[PDB]
Amino acid sequence: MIQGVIQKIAGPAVIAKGMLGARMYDICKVGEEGLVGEIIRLDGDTAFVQVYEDTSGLKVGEPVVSTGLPLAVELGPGMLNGIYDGIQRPLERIREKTGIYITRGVVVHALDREKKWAWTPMVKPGDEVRGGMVLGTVPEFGFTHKILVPPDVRGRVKEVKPAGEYTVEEPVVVLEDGTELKMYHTWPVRRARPVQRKLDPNTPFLTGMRILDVLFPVAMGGTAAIPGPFGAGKSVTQQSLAKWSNADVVVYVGCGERGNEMTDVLVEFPELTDPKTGGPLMHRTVLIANTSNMPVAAREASIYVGVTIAEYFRDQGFSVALMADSTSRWAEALREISSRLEEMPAEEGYPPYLAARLAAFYERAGKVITLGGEEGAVTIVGAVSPPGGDMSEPVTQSTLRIVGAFWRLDASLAFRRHFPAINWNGSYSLFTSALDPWYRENVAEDYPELRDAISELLQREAGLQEIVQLVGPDALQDAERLVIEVGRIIREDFLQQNAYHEVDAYCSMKKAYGIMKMILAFYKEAEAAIKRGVSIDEILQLPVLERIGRARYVSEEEFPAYFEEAMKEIQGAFKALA
Amino acid sequence: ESAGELLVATARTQARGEVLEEVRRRVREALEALPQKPEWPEVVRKLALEALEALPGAKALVANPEDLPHLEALARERGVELQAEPALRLGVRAVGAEGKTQVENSLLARLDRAWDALSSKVAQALWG
Amino acid sequence: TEALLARYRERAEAEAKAVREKAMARLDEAVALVLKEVLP
Amino acid sequence: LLKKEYTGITYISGPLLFVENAKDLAYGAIVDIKDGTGRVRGGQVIEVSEEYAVIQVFEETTGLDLATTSVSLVEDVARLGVSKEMLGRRFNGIGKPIDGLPPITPEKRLPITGLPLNPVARRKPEQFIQTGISTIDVMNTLVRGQKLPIFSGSGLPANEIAAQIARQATVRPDLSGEGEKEEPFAVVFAAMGITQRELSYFIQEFERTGALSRSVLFLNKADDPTIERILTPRMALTVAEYLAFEHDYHVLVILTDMTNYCEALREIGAAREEIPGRRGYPGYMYTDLATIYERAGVVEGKKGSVTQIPILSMPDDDRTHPIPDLTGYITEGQIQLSRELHRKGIYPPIDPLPSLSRLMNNGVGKGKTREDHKQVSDQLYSAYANGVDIRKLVAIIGEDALTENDRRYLQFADAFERFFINQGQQNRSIEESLQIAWALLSMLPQGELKRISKDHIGKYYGQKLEEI
Amino acid sequence: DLLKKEYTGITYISGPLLFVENAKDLAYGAIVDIKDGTGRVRGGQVIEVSEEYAVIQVFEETTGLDLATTSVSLVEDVARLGVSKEMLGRRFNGIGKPIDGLPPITPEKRLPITGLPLNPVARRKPEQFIQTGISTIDVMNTLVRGQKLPIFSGSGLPANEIAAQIARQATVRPDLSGEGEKEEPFAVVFAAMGITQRELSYFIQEFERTGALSRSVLFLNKADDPTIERILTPRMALTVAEYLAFEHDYHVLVILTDMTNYCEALREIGAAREEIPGRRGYPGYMYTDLATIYERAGVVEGKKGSVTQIPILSMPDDDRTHPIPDLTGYITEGQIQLSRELHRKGIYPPIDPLPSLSRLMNNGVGKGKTREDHKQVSDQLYSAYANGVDIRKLVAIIGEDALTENDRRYLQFADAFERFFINQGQQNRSIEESLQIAWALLSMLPQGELKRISKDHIGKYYGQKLEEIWG
């Protein structure tokens, strides 16, 4: 066990001396406190350690011990409904021990070693197991957590525990080689967990927001980026994605953000109900919380921990969603550490390998065939925070080369309280054509043409808005007047969404389809009536517009009747108008 | 269309792979039994000699204890020390003057270094 | 429609056997040549 | 304790100082540097290695030399001696009293950098603070435990608004249904980069109306050592945390100009040869600002609170400058001062269209304020919104192309800007702000008030603006 | 020879570099094998050697290495690759090893992957015209056989679909030049650098549809593979291509799927060494480095093969002045630049013809080739379209009603051009269809305004209507 002494301290970086024999990217214990660090450069007899804690008060000459292992996480039953910090330590245990502050150096296990899980086996003596197969299952909040073989183990079963209640560190299956498999195992967070085969995404990932689900869809194993300047409500959108998605498990990574957001989750989610099952919402969520005033070098650790936990739950056969709350903070941590190393930087002070780390992180997503043979997926939605709302910075330009969807938030929409404040002129998506076969069987037969008609309507109205900018709405004919009015109708009755209404917060696909159909039908009837001589005034004064305005505040089960009646009224409002 | 052609070409390629692998295994087994042959000592001497000729100024020689006595009569002539070791087989490995430089002249090593160069010859001589 | 696949499966297996036998012909010389060359 | 010195100085240049072996200096410690004349400076260990320790001198290095200077420890972490009887006092930026009265006697000594609050140990802010400014109390409510900056400009009057909020704020508990008037505020007022004229203004402002009895003042002039700017907010917040989470106080902290804080930070950072940032600001300004702003909030199982109101001047009225931009990513909303309202003669020139408070929905409504608060605020915002764009279109096309309700809306916009926003120096309770808002709404017909529910749209609609 | 020498005495590991001392017996540019305490072997290449120590750039990641146990041994003095005709159905990773499960190849030759420059005397002028079935390329920016023609793309624009369509539809038209009638298909060498899984699945499904896999070599360096390997992928692909072309007389088409990732790897390995930078940190020798890749194309005098390059690169902020597109434009012969505004209107393929260019276009058009009116039709189209765009810029200020009549005719021409000549959407147009559409569009203008076309070409092509070609 290599052990040396500290030689030089500067910020979060510590140079240890006497460490000949320490491996790159191993874990160390710095100081007599035992702070956790990782070796990122070897030189002569020394080693360069980045510390995941506060290095204040350290002294030269203190012990440094290398453990010989890379950063790893404990994967097993007991992670759901918990909250962790950047290196997977349960924050509730820290609170039970050391009060309302986060002092450094506490040691707790990630999975509770005193709980009892109702084990139910699935193998017999003499059977053959290889990496990724299923030994048995354990219930957890209504899920069925199934115990997997660690991805690099082979052998033949020698005995099994007989269906009792045990703790996680109870060896349940022993192989003929003598190796023991418990209810948990470890994995290095920088190595992607392997799969058998990558598949192509064919199923939408429903977020609950109309504009994202209709105009810029993302597929089940896809990747999205949502960069937005401050004051554009990025936090509300992320929380809504966490609250209404159709994923089985949500992993929320708060990499360098406000702490009140983590508190909002912790307080509200135990009250809300899971749509899929009957349970509370918190029972399907895992949080990793590394706020803005916690140690800087732990933000990257938190990113990697989150994506490894998501990969584990995917390997179990679920479909996971991973929300990385901000990747600009991870980029800033990278920049700081590279600054301590005296490296030459790339364009905006960032290290020259930032794009490689980003690409390797986003490339862990996708639909797969797991090693056990079942099918799971992982969807990544990463947030960015460009400095001046400037989409030409390094992080945004490196993220836009690997994501499949781009949801661009805008500040002009937010300064007039138009929420979710997504700019439909700068956004795009690359999954929309491969998803049409699903839309045609599961929403409506002609949903794609509805969506396309809405899009071209929006494009035309935004185009001629430039003309009306100068010469006033008085100077153009009734057709363009109707087009501007229909644009206003769309972007106040369809694109908007109140996130604090008990009805408008979540919106299904059938409902969005209904509203789109209503609007298009009205537009056609109005165009006919106009070209047979009526004016815009009587068109605007109609009351059915009030019916379409209140359409999004209608509950889901009582929407079909509302839709039928509104179609009848749309017909009658112009039939009686000759 | 071309799918059948791909099938037949895959079959041909993997058949050639099988036979070349077999030839390589054949010579791997032919090598690993030589220390029972009467040419063993002189080949080991010339191997150690070209090894020492590759390190001008070695300080030692590592070998196998079982063939250690084959190797005493030729290192005294130049002063390079001896040392035996069970793991090194079918060859000899020198050590440079600083301790930070080595040269190994094992049999299987030369085999793995030359097999790729000779694969073309084996193909041209085992088919046409 | 499938007769092409059948014909090609036949051709593949035939050529595989042909190559294997044409190889087992002179493998005994190939191995001796390689052992000659690898040796110092 | 006992004094141990180091005399192995081997290099002095600019602000740094290389002390030989001195291996007992912990990284980040505070030292003091005495020289051949006796004048004692202070310093901080920014790097320690086996050969030498690197020291940053708080003042300038004039007079130091390599033969007669010595360095001794002070402590391993900077601390501050606090006590409940700091209320009514006045300090200088590192705690020395400058009001003339004798120094305080400390009952604790807390490290000034503080510790991060465990996210599982917080709770959501829930109650509101009545500032007496209607355009904040009604439309951008300040919630107990929030961080709500004020975005000012060059010559806009942010000093006066700070002082007015400071001397008007109360907690107003009888609205809550408890009648527990049993705990008043404390107001910790931190001032940075301030001039003599503003200093006199603030002193007499606090002394005039008896607001000093419940305030602690940390005043820092523009001619003090730069290291004393980057410590003033930290001492202010340490005092505030002590008060709030040891004596159940409700504290309101006002940091008067973070634009000066950021210049001090840039100047100190460029002396350590670090990698620059967007406009020369250090690459870690976000983390440094975060360690200050994130010290506010409310904790579970305790009755205190810490509310922050940063104040800063956007340079060149640029909203994308790094200072206001980075402050935007950390806080929970913003209040913006407008220049056109200033030209019109309005005061305080708060612009209600680009302002927002994210935590407002929790602190208002039934049991906390009057019931109609939320919908009234929303309808007021929406009605002011379209008045402005009507004025924009009439500005270019003729006002001949007009309708019957656009007259209503222009009239509403003007009476709004002149009665709701322009409240002068008076202190308005929440009830009369709500009453003025209802009066201003009542001059728009129903059906135009499509945002408020139908019961209090009759309950409160009667009274019109005639009452002034 | 055959004996192995191992260098211990590693003294430094950080990022992608590794210093080793007492290694003067390594050649500059050699290939080494780095073996750790686990027995796992990874590769590297010497980039500076002196009497004291040598500097190595590691290809894999450096996790697990330590200064006590790892060793360094030589592989060869020059980096070479084993080539063969029998690699025409295979897939290799970014450093040339098989990844389809079949055994490795038996090399006929081993060639240095750095290559040698072609002799300017030994070269030949590229003249054979290639019909891609895309009108904006065939009529306005003709591609010839043996040319360098990149595609300047953006982030969300469909450059991959254009490349795959070109590969599917490209053919020579020997009946028009009267020479040869073999029309032997193209062999495709496809080098991917830092590709994602979505785009890789796209390209694979495409080639599998078309049946073009049985004559294609694939070098895949995915986005989760190590970064420093991208230095070797294009050199290996072009080694194989030049071998096939100038030994077995194939007609090869090389597709390099993203040069931006190549430049990222270059900048990383150049910043680790503190080179004098270029404009945004890109090393000062990036021009020479890219020129050694792009210039490995063309036709050789006295031989039948050819090599054609289609690099693809994404201008970062749609910025034509960024270092990567700037230098690449200074090397290659013209470019095909995509437009985001055209993409937003639903137009496919979104090729705007004004910032595009093909320098070799005049070598392979005209009489004895496609048709005698090709060149003049092309530049007349350019002039008319430029006029349409300027008139759009004027309408944006003085309103559409204030226009004259000929101005409205130019406005209409620009619009119909964009919506009928550019927007073809996956159909395969022969060159005659393209020229027919071009003349139907030109006939909108008055006959007296086609001032770049002669009188006889006007006389015998003017006057077709668009409704006739299709309704």
PDB file of C-alpha atoms in Angstrom, chain B residues 6-111:
ATOM      1  CA  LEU B   6     -20.643 -12.152 -48.924  1.00  0.00           C
ATOM      2  CA  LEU B   7     -21.555 -15.498 -47.379  1.00  0.00           C
ATOM      3  CA  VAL B   8     -19.252 -17.536 -49.609  1.00  0.00           C
ATOM      4  CA  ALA B   9     -16.414 -15.035 -49.220  1.00  0.00           C
ATOM      5  CA  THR B  10     -16.767 -15.075 -45.433  1.00  0.00           C
ATOM      6  CA  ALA B  11     -16.602 -18.864 -45.497  1.00  0.00           C
ATOM      7  CA  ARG B  12     -13.427 -18.794 -47.589  1.00  0.00           C
ATOM      8  CA  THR B  13     -11.748 -16.163 -45.414  1.00  0.00           C
ATOM      9  CA  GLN B  14     -12.472 -17.943 -42.159  1.00  0.00           C
ATOM     10  CA  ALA B  15     -11.367 -21.286 -43.597  1.00  0.00           C
ATOM     11  CA  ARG B  16      -7.999 -19.811 -44.521  1.00  0.00           C
ATOM     12  CA  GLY B  17      -7.863 -18.352 -41.028  1.00  0.00           C
ATOM     13  CA  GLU B  18      -8.456 -21.767 -39.483  1.00  0.00           C
ATOM     14  CA  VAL B  19      -5.688 -23.441 -41.452  1.00  0.00           C
ATOM     15  CA  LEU B  20      -3.144 -20.683 -40.818  1.00  0.00           C
ATOM     16  CA  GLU B  21      -3.942 -20.773 -37.109  1.00  0.00           C
ATOM     17  CA  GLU B  22      -3.407 -24.529 -37.188  1.00  0.00           C
ATOM     18  CA  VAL B  23       0.010 -24.187 -38.807  1.00  0.00           C
ATOM     19  CA  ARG B  24       0.978 -21.621 -36.194  1.00  0.00           C
ATOM     20  CA  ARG B  25      -0.105 -23.916 -33.355  1.00  0.00           C
ATOM     21  CA  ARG B  26       1.839 -26.742 -34.994  1.00  0.00           C
ATOM     22  CA  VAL B  27       5.062 -24.753 -34.926  1.00  0.00           C
ATOM     23  CA  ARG B  28       4.306 -23.452 -31.422  1.00  0.00           C
ATOM     24  CA  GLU B  29       4.235 -27.052 -30.248  1.00  0.00           C
ATOM     25  CA  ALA B  30       7.287 -27.971 -32.312  1.00  0.00           C
ATOM     26  CA  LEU B  31       9.258 -25.223 -30.575  1.00  0.00           C
ATOM     27  CA  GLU B  32       8.175 -25.887 -26.979  1.00  0.00           C
ATOM     28  CA  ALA B  33       9.856 -29.319 -26.948  1.00  0.00           C
ATOM     29  CA  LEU B  34      13.364 -28.464 -28.157  1.00  0.00           C
ATOM     30  CA  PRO B  35      15.299 -28.542 -24.797  1.00  0.00           C
ATOM     31  CA  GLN B  36      15.265 -32.324 -25.230  1.00  0.00           C
ATOM     32  CA  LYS B  37      17.142 -32.103 -28.564  1.00  0.00           C
ATOM     33  CA  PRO B  38      20.923 -32.378 -29.053  1.00  0.00           C
ATOM     34  CA  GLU B  39      21.135 -29.001 -30.809  1.00  0.00           C
ATOM     35  CA  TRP B  40      19.758 -27.307 -27.688  1.00  0.00           C
ATOM     36  CA  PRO B  41      23.071 -26.130 -26.151  1.00  0.00           C
ATOM     37  CA  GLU B  42      24.550 -24.555 -29.272  1.00  0.00           C
ATOM     38  CA  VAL B  43      21.362 -22.721 -30.208  1.00  0.00           C
ATOM     39  CA  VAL B  44      21.100 -21.375 -26.658  1.00  0.00           C
ATOM     40  CA  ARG B  45      24.712 -20.225 -26.809  1.00  0.00           C
ATOM     41  CA  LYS B  46      24.194 -18.368 -30.079  1.00  0.00           C
ATOM     42  CA  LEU B  47      20.958 -16.835 -28.757  1.00  0.00           C
ATOM     43  CA  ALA B  48      22.730 -15.487 -25.685  1.00  0.00           C
ATOM     44  CA  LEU B  49      25.560 -14.316 -27.912  1.00  0.00           C
ATOM     45  CA  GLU B  50      23.372 -12.215 -30.195  1.00  0.00           C
ATOM     46  CA  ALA B  51      21.563 -10.911 -27.110  1.00  0.00           C
ATOM     47  CA  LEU B  52      24.845  -9.746 -25.559  1.00  0.00           C
ATOM     48  CA  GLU B  53      25.852  -8.335 -28.931  1.00  0.00           C
ATOM     49  CA  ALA B  54      22.675  -6.238 -28.786  1.00  0.00           C
ATOM     50  CA  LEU B  55      23.480  -4.755 -25.338  1.00  0.00           C
ATOM     51  CA  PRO B  56      26.987  -3.327 -25.456  1.00  0.00           C
ATOM     52  CA  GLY B  57      27.781  -3.407 -21.767  1.00  0.00           C
ATOM     53  CA  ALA B  58      25.320  -5.728 -20.061  1.00  0.00           C
ATOM     54  CA  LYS B  59      25.789  -6.442 -16.369  1.00  0.00           C
ATOM     55  CA  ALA B  60      24.062  -9.809 -15.976  1.00  0.00           C
ATOM     56  CA  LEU B  61      22.200 -12.648 -17.664  1.00  0.00           C
ATOM     57  CA  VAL B  62      18.900 -14.198 -16.602  1.00  0.00           C
ATOM     58  CA  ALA B  63      18.051 -17.719 -17.738  1.00  0.00           C
ATOM     59  CA  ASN B  64      16.407 -20.961 -16.595  1.00  0.00           C
ATOM     60  CA  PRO B  65      18.117 -23.007 -13.845  1.00  0.00           C
ATOM     61  CA  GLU B  66      17.525 -26.220 -15.803  1.00  0.00           C
ATOM     62  CA  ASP B  67      19.664 -24.938 -18.691  1.00  0.00           C
ATOM     63  CA  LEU B  68      21.902 -22.808 -16.464  1.00  0.00           C
ATOM     64  CA  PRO B  69      24.951 -25.131 -16.819  1.00  0.00           C
ATOM     65  CA  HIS B  70      24.711 -24.759 -20.589  1.00  0.00           C
ATOM     66  CA  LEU B  71      25.429 -21.053 -20.107  1.00  0.00           C
ATOM     67  CA  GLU B  72      28.420 -20.811 -17.757  1.00  0.00           C
ATOM     68  CA  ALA B  73      31.222 -21.483 -20.235  1.00  0.00           C
ATOM     69  CA  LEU B  74      30.514 -18.432 -22.431  1.00  0.00           C
ATOM     70  CA  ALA B  75      29.794 -15.558 -20.028  1.00  0.00           C
ATOM     71  CA  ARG B  76      33.077 -15.778 -18.122  1.00  0.00           C
ATOM     72  CA  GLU B  77      34.834 -14.809 -21.360  1.00  0.00           C
ATOM     73  CA  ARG B  78      33.337 -11.305 -21.112  1.00  0.00           C
ATOM     74  CA  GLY B  79      32.544 -10.984 -17.406  1.00  0.00           C
ATOM     75  CA  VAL B  80      28.763 -10.720 -17.627  1.00  0.00           C
ATOM     76  CA  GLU B  81      27.310 -12.170 -14.432  1.00  0.00           C
ATOM     77  CA  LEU B  82      24.799 -15.036 -14.386  1.00  0.00           C
ATOM     78  CA  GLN B  83      21.422 -15.516 -12.715  1.00  0.00           C
ATOM     79  CA  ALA B  84      18.815 -18.267 -13.032  1.00  0.00           C
ATOM     80  CA  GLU B  85      15.022 -18.002 -13.062  1.00  0.00           C
ATOM     81  CA  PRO B  86      12.178 -20.527 -13.515  1.00  0.00           C
ATOM     82  CA  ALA B  87       9.769 -18.329 -15.495  1.00  0.00           C
ATOM     83  CA  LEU B  88      12.091 -17.478 -18.403  1.00  0.00           C
ATOM     84  CA  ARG B  89      11.969 -20.426 -20.789  1.00  0.00           C
ATOM     85  CA  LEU B  90      13.367 -21.361 -24.197  1.00  0.00           C
ATOM     86  CA  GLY B  91      15.782 -18.450 -24.242  1.00  0.00           C
ATOM     87  CA  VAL B  92      17.811 -15.910 -22.319  1.00  0.00           C
ATOM     88  CA  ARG B  93      17.310 -12.278 -21.284  1.00  0.00           C
ATOM     89  CA  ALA B  94      20.129  -9.810 -20.631  1.00  0.00           C
ATOM     90  CA  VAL B  95      20.116  -6.765 -18.339  1.00  0.00           C
ATOM     91  CA  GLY B  96      21.616  -3.377 -19.136  1.00  0.00           C
ATOM     92  CA  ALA B  97      24.144  -1.447 -17.114  1.00  0.00           C
ATOM     93  CA  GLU B  98      21.695   0.858 -15.348  1.00  0.00           C
ATOM     94  CA  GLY B  99      19.125  -1.811 -14.534  1.00  0.00           C
ATOM     95  CA  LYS B 100      16.675   0.123 -16.717  1.00  0.00           C
ATOM     96  CA  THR B 101      17.226  -1.728 -19.993  1.00  0.00           C
ATOM     97  CA  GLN B 102      16.672  -5.360 -20.936  1.00  0.00           C
ATOM     98  CA  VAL B 103      16.857  -7.592 -23.997  1.00  0.00           C
ATOM     99  CA  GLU B 104      15.016 -10.904 -24.191  1.00  0.00           C
ATOM    100  CA  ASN B 105      15.732 -13.559 -26.808  1.00  0.00           C
ATOM    101  CA  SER B 106      13.078 -16.172 -26.086  1.00  0.00           C
ATOM    102  CA  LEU B 107      11.886 -18.562 -28.768  1.00  0.00           C
ATOM    103  CA  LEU B 108       8.166 -17.767 -28.644  1.00  0.00           C
ATOM    104  CA  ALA B 109       9.067 -14.084 -28.643  1.00  0.00           C
ATOM    105  CA  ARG B 110      10.888 -14.396 -31.964  1.00  0.00           C
ATOM    106  CA  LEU B 111       7.953 -16.458 -33.196  1.00  0.00           C
TER     107      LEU B 111
END
